[PDB]
Amino acid sequence: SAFITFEGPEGSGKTTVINEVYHRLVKDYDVIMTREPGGVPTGEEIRKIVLEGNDMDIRTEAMLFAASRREHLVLKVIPALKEGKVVLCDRYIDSSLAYQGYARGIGVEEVRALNEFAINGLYPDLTIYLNVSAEVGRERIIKNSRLDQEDLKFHEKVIEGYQEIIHNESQRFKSVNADQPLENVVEDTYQTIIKYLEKI
Amino acid sequence: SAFITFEGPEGSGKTTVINEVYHRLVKDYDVIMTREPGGVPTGEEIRKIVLEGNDMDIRTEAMLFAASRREHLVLKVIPALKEGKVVLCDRYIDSSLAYQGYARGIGVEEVRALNEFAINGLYPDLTIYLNVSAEVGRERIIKNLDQEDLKFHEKVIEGYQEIIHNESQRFKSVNADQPLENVVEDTYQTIIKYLEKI
Ligand SMILES: CCNc1cc([C@@H](c2ccccc2)N2CCC[C@H](n3cc(C)c(=O)[nH]c3=O)C2)cc(Oc2cccc(Cl)c2)c1C(=O)O
Ligand SMILES: CCNc1cc([C@@H](c2ccccc2)N2CCC[C@H](n3cc(C)c(=O)[nH]c3=O)C2)cc(Oc2cccc(Cl)c2)c1C(=O)O
């Protein structure tokens, strides 16, 4: 079994990459694609509170992302890992660290303490970081629409946040150059994963 | 002016909601409510071809919905927006994306390329998504199903969820699992809040 998380800002090609990697890995492995809350009832109820919130306090929001993370981990991820599955998870702890911790300014160490209470030692076996520059990311976000200064600044802070998290911690982390055309990003991600799965 | 579209599967209370919301807004706004083809002659002739179709190829069907969309947009919507009106439109691009693109399996990106040729940059200012769960939706449809109908209804909802997930900025999701009185109220409030910001 393997617990593989995918991290990156919007515009990193993360959705395309997970889907294409899934379609290739399924040939050889019993693989599932998931994201939080991922259909888990309590997590779905938490997701409704977050989405229906009117100017919700950022710490309450962080605690709800963490509660949805736990429910998804306990009721979906852990049972799949027990069945010997390869679990491809779109966003995990590092998303809370980059978004709530860094970009929203709660503090990375504070959001880490919160999320370590939530995951209780269950860190990913491997984390794919889709390393996109703000500029390439911006262009992909514009393309995927129909950006204002606040959106551009928030996108930059998320990227700065991811750079800081990787700078301080890098073992499970494997950074893929997401500035490349998506065909190459998919190939490098697939190769990185196969290399890991073949080391058992 | 404002171009407001309404989207959702059957069983979302969309007909009731748009009709009741239009009845309220018509007291305080220069607003019109329409749907495709909306009486536009070319659109009406296209509608007859779609409705009289015997196992029509899904891509032909998508092109006819997009041709009806253009005629209605050009002859009805654009002139009203030029007069400074609020235009309430029941189903637009997102219906083609969810039904032809996702549920029928042509592909969302392919149906989007087709519809972007049809709308030529005229995306809605605001799209109200009547967010109903498959289960509540099913019950409303029965009140107003075989395995194929149930599966198609679920796919349409999955389709809408995917479109909103990838393009969340344009949409305002209203909880359509609520009694229709509350769905109408939340939609009305969402619209008035938007119109008062510009
Ligand atoms: C366009 C995608 N649609 C959605 C968009 C968002 C959005 C957001 C942030 C704050 C407040 C409201 C909405 N935002 C988008 C980039 C990544 C970000 N994000 C993710 C993770 C995993 C995290 O830990 N921290 C964090 O900031 C979540 C939140 C969403 O709902 C969730 C998701 C997971 C769990 C729950 Cl409880 C609720 C959804 C959704 O429709 O599922
Ligand atoms: C009982 C409701 N009556 C009607 C029901 C339908 C029906 C359908 C689908 C496929 C084949 C045959 C009938 N279906 C109902 C759910 C939404 C769906 N739908 C909508 C839009 C806007 C889209 O883009 N794609 C899509 O799948 C249309 C099509 C209709 O005719 C139209 C409407 C707009 C334009 C034209 Cl050309 C023709 C009508 C009608 O009486 O007007």
By three-state DSSP, how is residue B173 classified?
A: strand
Rounded CA separation B169/A131 (Å)? 24
Q: Please classify residue B132 by burial: count the beta carbons closer than 10 Å to its beta carbon, then call 0-12 exposed, 13-18 middle and 19+ buried.
A: buried
Residue B120, by phi and psi: left (phi above 0), alpha (psi -120 to 50) or beta?
Answer: left
Rounded CA separation B3/A171 (Å)? 51
Residue A105, by phi and psi: left (phi above 0), alpha (psi -120 to 50) or beta?
Answer: left
Report angle CA A52, A53, A56 to the nearest 5 degrees: 165
Q: Nearest Cα to B173, choosing from A123, A93, A52? A: A52
Backbone breaks in chain A after residues (C–N over 2.5 Å): 146
Residue A94, by phi and psi: left (phi above 0), alpha (psi -120 to 50) or beta?
Answer: alpha
Tokens of residue A60, six digits: 């309450």
Tokens of residue B39, six digits: 């009486």
Q: What is the nearest CA distance from A145 to chain B, expressed in angstroms? A: 6
Which atom of ligand 1 lies at the shortest distance from residue A99's CA?
27
A152 interaction partners in chain B (CB closer than 8 Å): none
Contacting residues for B121 by C-beta, under 8 A, at least 6 apart: A146
Rounded CA separation B125/B143 (Å)? 33
Residue B127, beta-bridge partner list: B5, B171
Rounded CA separation B108/B159 (Å)? 8
Q: What number of C-beta contacts closer than 8 Å exist between A and B?
A: 11
Positive/negative CA dihedral, A86, A90, A92, A95: positive
A144 interaction partners in chain B (CB closer than 8 Å): 166-167
Amino acid at position B42, single letter:
T
Integer angstrom CA distances of residue A121 from A70, A115, A125, A162: 11, 10, 11, 21
Amino acid at position B194, single letter:
Y
Backbone breaks in chain B after residues (C–N over 2.5 Å): 144
Residue A130, beta-bridge partner list: A176
- Beta-carbon-side half-sphere exposure of residue B6 (alpha carbons within 13 Å): 29
Rounded CA separation B72/B44 (Å)? 10
Cα B168 to chain centroid distance, Å, stands at 16
Locate tokens 């779109």: which residue? A90
| Ligand 2 centroid distance, CA of A46 (Å) | 35
Q: Please classify residue A148 by burial: count the beta carbons closer than 10 Å to its beta carbon, then call 0-12 exposed, 13-18 middle and 19+ buried.
A: exposed
Amino acid at position B39, single letter:
G
Q: Which residue of A has its CA nearest to B168?
A: A145
Q: Are B177 and B133 spatial neighbours (Cβ–Cβ below 8 Å)?
A: yes
By three-state DSSP, how is residue A141 classified?
A: helix
Angle between helices B108-119 and B147-166 (to 10 degrees): 70
Print burial letters for B28-54: b (CB count within 10 Å at least 16), e (below 16). Answer: ebebbbbbbbbebeebeebbeeeeeee
Residue B131, beta-bridge partner list: B175
Tokens of residue A182, six digits: 């998506």
Residues of A near B (CB-CB distance < 8 A)? 15, 51-52, 144-146
Rounded CA separation B188/B177 (Å)? 16
Domain boundaries, chain A: 1-200
> HEC profile for A15-82?
HHHHHHHHHHHCCCCCEEEEECCCCCHHHHHHHHHHHCCCCCCHHHHHHHHHHHHHHHHHHHHHHHHH
Rounded CA separation A198/A189 (Å)? 14
CB atoms within 10 A of CB B12: 28
Integer angstrom CA distances of residue A120 from A1, A56, A70, A93: 19, 26, 9, 11
Tokens of residue B107, six digits: 């592909």
Residue A4 is inside which H or E element, if any? strand A2-7
Which atom of ligand 1 lies at the shortest distance from residue A66's CA?
24
Residue A87, beta-bridge partner list: A3, A32
B93 interaction partners in chain A (CB closer than 8 Å): none
Q: Is the peptide bond before A181 cis (omega within 30 degrees of 0)?
A: no
Does ligand 1 come within 6 angstroms of the Cβ of A5?
A: no
Rounded CA separation B142/B139 (Å)? 5
Rounded CA separation A100/A98 (Å)? 6
Q: Are A137 and A11 spatial neighbours (Cβ–Cβ below 8 Å)?
A: yes
Residue B6, φ and ψ in degrees, nearest 5: -120, 130
CB-CB: which of B169, B173, B175 is closest to A145? B169
Locate tokens 């019950």: which residue? B139
Tokens of residue B197, six digits: 């910001």
Contacting residues for B63 by C-beta, under 8 A, at least 6 apart: B114
Rounded CA separation A32/A92 (Å)? 15
By three-state DSSP, how is residue B37 classified?
A: coil
Q: How far does chain B reach from its first CA to its final CA, in angstroms?
A: 9
CATH number of B1-198: 3.40.50.300
Amino acid at position A13, single letter:
G
Integer angstrom CA distances of residue A85 from A25, A127, B18: 11, 16, 46
CATH number of A1-200: 3.40.50.300
Locate tokens 């344009």: which residue? B170
Q: Given in angstroms, what resolution was this structure solved at?
A: 1.9
Residue A150, φ and ψ in degrees, nearest 5: -65, -45
Rounded CA separation A54/A52 (Å)? 7
Positive/negative CA dihedral, B173, B103, A44, A153: negative
β-pair type (B31-35, B86-90): parallel
